[PDB]
Design a protein around this ligand. Structure first.
Ligand SMILES: Nc1ncnc2c1ncn2[C@@H]1O[C@H](COP(=O)(O)OP(=O)(O)O)[C@@H](O)[C@H]1O
Ligand SMILES: [Mg+2]
Length: 962
RNA sequence: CUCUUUCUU
């Protein structure tokens, strides 16, 4: 079977920009190039995707001697074959971009067939003549980011004049003297602070302390490398601040600190606040999304995630004295972005000091990055830890694989059967029987039971790939007789999309006689510290998001963690007392793990980050990314540039239009930002914002019970006769708002009854409120964002909701599909796909829907391309908002996006299609004058009126029985 | 058949 998967994966969307290079000729061209340049390199099919979903992966690595670069690729696949095709296409496109191969120009082929039957659409005479009048009316057919030392009457964090309080005649010198006197008095009198310094002097970092300061005082860029638990993050900023205060210059110090994760930043800020024996928000503050406590403008340490600093960079960095980047080894997009921006900072302004601190980096690489900068190694760690591997526990608890899986069970190197002959025979058989991709719950239960038998107090930490395995393990352990006793063991998950209360529950102490088992993803990997952690159990798997750009496919892959991730998870233990680190993989597998995971820049879209580049005015995108540490593939850069230019956020000169600036200021996908602005023009910004926020969450609203492959009848009614996920999400959020407003326990019981997710609703509402606030900041009047109650039970027409569903087509372009029966739909160019089990439109019967056109939010690959966040849309909405060009096919059939066929009058088709440039002009004029969107010239008011009349559900149901 | 790595004043 599964020819449909090959047909769907061969699909291409952006072959036009890359010189007509597609899958069908990419492998041939790559083979020809390799033969010509006598390159003997070959694919590295890296099997992944566990075993119930044996996907694969692939990665060539051709080397271009002439230019001296090394053009490389990394792609996903559902069977070696397809991946290799995608990798070859990426490599060929990249090699084309630096002009080493001529653009393709000959011929491909056409199989089409299966052409879909036309869908008749008719419009009422009043609608047509209104469109005619509307058409007649609308006459239709670089600089340097600045820096400055701290100044009087200026706030560093807010970058605004104070003009308030009694801090007007207070100079910097007087403030520094007051700070020095206060610090001396605190040191002399308070005994808790003195005890804290007595503890701090015992840390290894103290032995290096003095010389570290010298480096900071002699070189703008300093790299610090040391073992985990040696006290870098909570000590370096304090050392700098205390030196500045004691040296009579306490008012001239401002030390930013950047943490890779929210919980890490919060925990480190709290620990710094406790170490100075002071309340939060006075000297040390933190600023993460949806939670910010700010310290005094002078002599303060601010902990913020990298994205927060990137958003702060728009206002400039006037008044900062030091910037610290922790966990630089993360290699993600924001870290490298901040690295380039900080290099520019140091080069332009030598007074600013930048300190890079981490535990496991290539010191030579980052030193040569900054044009040779000092690197200081901190020797020694806090306490030693004992490390074990899978075969060690197998010998060390006499575990035997269950007969259960022994038969339930029923050339890639399987390291689980390779081990030293020092160990016993039965241990070797037990190690060999276990598979690699899957995990064993019997193994974990036996290991935890033996740890209990060890009678060593302390928390247990289990690192897991994702939510599914975490909650499956929670359910499995809860059913056990021993671990089900809440008085003996307490199990806490640690996930970013879990409620914030549960995230903070991982730091609070537990009562006597109970052991805390924390099941975490890689959120608990870096820089956090829990006092009672003694045991770290590493499953050695990490999940990443693979994005195939040529077919616009997304997937989640559970791949083996690198050695750096394992070393950091090991370092999470043994910070206050010696412990154990049980790592679950063979010693051969441990030796076979990659050094570091691939950086995010090589496997992520760059449209948002290129837009941010243009916002802060660093210059051309291509040159800026050529200045980056690890240059992203040129094809991704050109795809981002074309995506922004085509959507009109950049003019012909690659400059920033006001729409581009406004979309840059929003924390949303640029397409979602344009869609939100259009929703604001039509006076439906509340629903528009909440719906856009649900389309950038990667979380689920409805929680199908473990296994059930459909929602049910409580949840599948929220959607109501609309048969759309977004209307159901709106109804659920509207009910949940009232339920919370009447009680928090009411919120919990409502979420239990209706089968929702409390954390998903909270994050969606918070993102929607932030979007509304930012839209208000730009000048859009509040009258455009009044909350509109949605009645999903009403069938027929609803202007606001229908125009919202129509604007979805513009916001989720080109994610459109056509349903046939049961769960089978066709995506663009008629590629077969399945409706996901979570979506409310999934059905086991051969039921039919009124309008067979859908727009979905995500296209996830599994063992069958699946779709996510579906919503039904009328043909008129699709024609208006879901295509760029509309043409005329044979026998008078209108063709949309070269794959949709409509039976509609060509004259009226041209009439309706002429409105899209008018809509672009409306967006431009609305973003130009945000305060003047609700009042407009008469032609644009008529345009809005006819668009509202066209976006009705039954606007094209005249004379049709349907 | 596995709905949910991290981040965005
Ligand atoms: N909750 C806590 N209880 C006791 N000690 C702590 C706690 N949090 C942090 N510490 C101590 O503070 C130090 C901070 O180390 P840190 O600089 O975060 O390590 P790294 O340099 O790897 O980030 C650690 O050595 C740890 O012993
Ligand atoms: Mg290394």
């Amino acid at each position: 079977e599964q020819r449909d998967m090959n047909e769907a994966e061969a699909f291409d969307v952006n072959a036009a920009i890359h010189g007509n290079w597609t899958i069908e000729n990419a492998k041939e061209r790559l083979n020809i190039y390799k033969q010509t340049n006598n390159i003997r390199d070959d694919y590295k099919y890296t099997p992944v995707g566990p075993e119930h979903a044996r996907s694969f992966l692939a990665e060539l690595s051709i080397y271009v001697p002439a230019l001296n670069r090394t053009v490389t690729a990394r792609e996903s696949g559902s069977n070696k074959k397809s991946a290799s095709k995608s990798c070859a296409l990426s490599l060929v496109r990249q090699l084309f971009h630096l002009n080493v191969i001529e653009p393709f120009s000959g011929t491909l082929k056409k199989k089409k067939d299966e052409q879909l039957k036309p869908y008749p659409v008719k419009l009422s005479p009043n609608l047509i003549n209104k469109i005619d009048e509307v058409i007649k009316g609308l006459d239709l057919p670089s600089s340097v980011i600045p820096w400055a030392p701290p100044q009087a009457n200026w706030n560093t964090w807010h970058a605004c004049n104070i003009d308030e309080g009694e801090l007007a005649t207070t100079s910097i010198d007087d403030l520094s003297m007051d700070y020095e006197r206060s610090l001396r008095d605190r040191r002399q009198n308070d005994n808790e602070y003195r005890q804290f310094l007595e503890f701090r002097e015992k840390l290894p970092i103290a032995a290096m302390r003095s010389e570290i300061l010298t480096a900071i005082n002699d070189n703008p860029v300093v790299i610090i490398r040391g073992n985990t638990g040696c006290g870098k993050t909570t000590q370096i900023a304090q050392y700098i601040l205390d030196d500045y205060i004691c040296s009579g210059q306490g008012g001239y110090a401002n030390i930013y600190v950047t943490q890779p994760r929210r919980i890490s930043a919060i925990s480190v800020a709290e620990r710094v606040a406790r170490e100075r024996c002071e309340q939060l928000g006075d000297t040390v503050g933190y600023s993460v999304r949806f939670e910010s406590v700010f310290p005094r403008p002078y002599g303060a340490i601010l902990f913020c995630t990298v994205g927060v600093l990137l958003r702060k960079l728009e206002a400039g960095l006037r008044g900062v004295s030091h910037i610290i980047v922790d966990e630089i080894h993360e290699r993600d997009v924001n870290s490298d972005f901040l690295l380039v921006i900080l290099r520019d900072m140091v080069d332009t302004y030598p007074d600013l000091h930048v300190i890079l601190m981490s535990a496991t980096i290539d010191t030579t690489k980052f030193s040569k990055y900054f044009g040779i900068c000092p690197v200081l190694e901190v020797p020694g760690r806090a306490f030693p830890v004992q490390q074990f591997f899978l075969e060690d526990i197998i010998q060390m608890t006499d575990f035997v694989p269950s007969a259960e899986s022994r038969r339930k069970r029923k050339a890639e190197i399987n390291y689980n059967k390779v081990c030293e002959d020092k160990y016993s025979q039965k241990t070797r058989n037990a190690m060999a029987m276990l598979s690699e991709s899957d995990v064993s719950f019997e193994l974990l239960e036996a290991l935890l039971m033996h740890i209990k038998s060890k009678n060593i107090p302390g928390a247990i930490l289990v690192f897991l790939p994702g939510w599914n395995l975490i909650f499956a393990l929670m359910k499995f352990l809860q059913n056990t007789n021993i671990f089900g006793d809440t008085s003996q063991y307490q199990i806490l998950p640690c996930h970013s999309q879990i409620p914030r209360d549960e995230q903070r529950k991982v730091f609070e102490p537990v009562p006597e006689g109970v052991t805390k088992i924390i099941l975490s993803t890689n959120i608990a990997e870096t820089s956090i510290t829990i006092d009672d952690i003694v045991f770290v159990i590493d499953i050695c798997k990490a999940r990443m998001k693979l994005f195939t750009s040529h077919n616009n496919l997304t997937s989640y892959a559970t791949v083996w963690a690198s050695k750096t991730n394992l070393e950091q998870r090991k370092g999470r233990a043994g910070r206050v007392r010696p412990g154990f680190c049980f790592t679950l993989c063979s010693r051969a597998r441990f030796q076979a793990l990659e050094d570091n995971l691939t950086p995010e820049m090589f496997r992520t879209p760059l449209h948002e980050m290129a837009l941010t580049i243009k916002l802060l005015r660093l210059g051309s995108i291509h040159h800026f990314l050529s200045k980056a540490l690890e240059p992203p593939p040129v094809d991704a850069v050109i795809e981002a540039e074309v995506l922004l230019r085509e959507m009109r956020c950049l003019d012909a000169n690659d400059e920033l239009t006001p729409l581009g600036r406004l979309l840059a200021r929003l924390p949303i996908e640029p397409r979602l930002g344009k869609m939100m602005v259009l929703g604001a023009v039509f006076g439906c910004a509340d629903l528009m914002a909440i719906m856009a926020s649900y389309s950038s969450t990667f979380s689920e609203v409805f929680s199908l019970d473990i296994g059930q492959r459909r929602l049910a009848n409580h949840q599948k009614a929220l959607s109501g006769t609309k048969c759309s996920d977004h209307v159901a999400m709106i109804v659920a959020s509207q009910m949940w708002r009232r339920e919370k407003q009447r009680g928090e326990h009411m919120e919990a019981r409502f979420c239990d009854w209706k089968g929702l997710q409390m954390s998903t609703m909270n994050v969606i509402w918070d993102a929607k409120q932030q979007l509304l606030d930012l839209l208000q900041q730009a000048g859009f009047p509040e009258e455009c964002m009044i909350s509109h109650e949605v009645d999903e039970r009403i069938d027929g027409d609803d202007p606001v909701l229908d125009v919202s569903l129509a604007l979805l087509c513009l916001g989720l372009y080109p994610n459109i599909c056509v349903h046939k029966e049961k769960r089978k739909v066709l995506t663009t160019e008629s590629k077969a796909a399945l409706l996901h089990k979570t979506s409310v439109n999934c059905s086991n019967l051969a039921v039919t829907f009124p309008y067979p056109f859908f727009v979905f939010g995500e296209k996830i690959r599994t063992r069958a391309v699946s779709c996510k966040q579906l919503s039904m849309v009328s043909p008129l909405q699709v024609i208006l908002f879901g295509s760029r060009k509309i043409d005329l096919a044979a026998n008078n059939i209108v063709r949309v996006d070269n794959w949709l066929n409509f039976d509609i009058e060509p004259e009226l088709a041209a009439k309706i299609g002429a409105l899209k440039p008018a809509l672009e002009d409306l967006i431009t004029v609305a973003c130009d004058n945000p305060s003047d969107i609700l009042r407009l010239e008469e032609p644009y008011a008529q345009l809005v009126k006819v668009v509202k009349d066209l976006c009705v559900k039954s606007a094209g149901d005249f004379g049709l029985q349907r």
